[PDB]
């Protein structure tokens with residue numbers, strides 16, 4: 001509908017796949033080469049389905065901060081025959097608050113879904129399903145089951161992936177440039 005939705009659509013059309021684990025179907029963001037991200041509660045194993053194709057997981061790393069606190073991001077390297085467009089230059093370099101963000105989801109349940117969530121707060125600490133979690137972003141939108149892995153963007157930045165909600169607010173794990181230095 002406007003330039004925020006334009007940027008979000010451009011990310012969805014080229015840098016997402018549908019990932020399936022034993023814990024469900026997730027929006028999965030491809031960042032560069034064969035490297036993607038997914039919420040840690042997806043419980044990625046040795047094999048994952050990518051757009052309903054059986055795919056070997058070459059590596060999976062559940063990220064924690066230097067205090068050994070959960071960040072809820074798993075970085076996955078996929079045994080895929082094709083690279084993602086490199087979008088690392090759209091990742092923020094520091095923790096921050098944002099205006100006018102969009103949450104975008106693409107699954108069997110929610111195809112081509114876009115949500116203007118408005119202002120995004122650097123919330124920080126969240127007890128997420130009983131698990132202390134850091135670097136959480138918060139938006140005052142009543143997100144539902146099926147949105148986990150959804151991409152949070154502003155114009156020109158990919159800032160996080162949806163990991164949960166309390167029925168009134170939604171929560172995303174930050175994406176930082178420093179997670180994807182090679």
Ligand SMILES: Oc1cnc(-c2ccccc2)nc1
Nearest residue numbers: 110115142143144145146147
């Ligand atoms: O037919 C409907 C189904 N689901 C939703 C929906 C609303 C908020 C978050 C996610 C999804 N809306 C309408």
